[PDB]
């Protein structure tokens, strides 16, 4: 199918307590493969997937060099942004940056993206055309025009359509055992007596990959979405994911309820009944 590479950068100022904390992570699809943490002792970009560990010294020296440079950029950004917003020097602030690319089933360039946020809200983002910018506010406008004049977009476009997809394809090849698999969810239902006249039916999906999945409860067919407690998909910690969905049901009515599971790794949608 299609695939994606994404890099996530977070920088947090710590006034009067040294330089800001910088953390970087890389993902291919739903699999993390690298990280950098400015408070760690190594000071190198580090592997977080078995299929990336043997990439070689050049690869590791290079990402380390570039990620430190990202760290310095965010450090200047925090200083700049505080100025744009005329803010106190004592408070901690946060810059976030995401960029990456998608390829299609044919592994051809599909799209690219490059976005910042300041204190948890949109700041400036690259448009889908990869040539123009969207500025959230007045502060960002200054960035907008500065990047327009510096031809910043063109150079981002060169990376996104080249290096970014070039290496995405290389990683998909290296880790094709991990990255080009789908693990179908192992599903089951549990029953718990909430009272003498009520019970919890919980529908479980376990050990699946990728993260995308739909769990829906129905009574006679009518979506019980409004009465469904649904948890966020969560990491099991071994590279697989978990999700569940529960309804409170009148005792005696269990047979009216079905759980429907859609996932990429399933040949067909699953319909679980209690019986």
């Amino acid at each position: 199918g299609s695939h994606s590479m994404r890099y996530f950068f977070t920088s947090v100022s710590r006034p009067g307590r040294g330089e800001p904390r910088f953390i970087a992570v890389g993902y291919v699809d739903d699999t993390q493969f690298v990280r950098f943490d400015s408070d760690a002792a190594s000071q190198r970009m580090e592997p977080r997937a078995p299929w990336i560990e043997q990439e070689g010294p050049e690869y590791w020296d290079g990402e380390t060099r570039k990620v430190k440079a990202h760290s310095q950029t965010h450090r200047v950004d925090l200083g700049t942004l505080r100025g744009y917003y005329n803010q106190s020097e004592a408070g901690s602030h946060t810059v976030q940056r995401m960029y990456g690319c998608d390829v299609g089933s044919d592994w051809r360039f599909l799209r690219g993206y490059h976005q910042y946020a300041y204190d948890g809200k949109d700041y400036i983002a690259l448009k889908e055309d990869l040539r123009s910018w969207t500025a959230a506010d007045m502060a960002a406008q200054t960035t907008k025009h500065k990047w327009e004049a510096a031809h910043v977009a063109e150079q981002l476009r060169a990376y996104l359509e080249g290096t970014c997809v070039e290496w995405l394809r290389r990683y998909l090849e290296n880790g094709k055992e991990t990255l080009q698999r789908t693990d179908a969810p192992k599903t089951h239902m549990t029953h718990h007596a909430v009272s003498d006249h009520e019970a919890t039916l919980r529908c479980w999906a376990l050990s699946f990959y990728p993260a995308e999945i739909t769990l829906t409860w129905q009574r006679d067919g009518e979506d019980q979405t409004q009465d469904t407690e649904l948890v966020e998909t969560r990491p099991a910690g071994d590279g697989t994911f978990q999700k569940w969905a529960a309804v409170v049901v009148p005792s005696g009515q269990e047979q009216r309820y079905t759980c429907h599971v859609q996932h990429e790794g399933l040949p067909k949608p699953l319909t679980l009944r209690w019986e």
């Binding site: 890099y7 890389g26 290079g62 990402e63 570039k66 990620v67 440079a69 990202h70 950029t73 200047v76 950004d77 700049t80 942004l81 810059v95 960029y99 910042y116 700041y123 400036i124 960035t143 990047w147 910043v152 150079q155 981002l156 990376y159 290096t163 970014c164 070039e166 290496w167």
Partner: peptide, 9 residues
């Protein structure tokens, strides 16, 4: 791989 550039706000 990360971008080699140095874009700044």
């Amino acid at each position: 791989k990360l971008t080699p550039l140095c874009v700044t706000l």
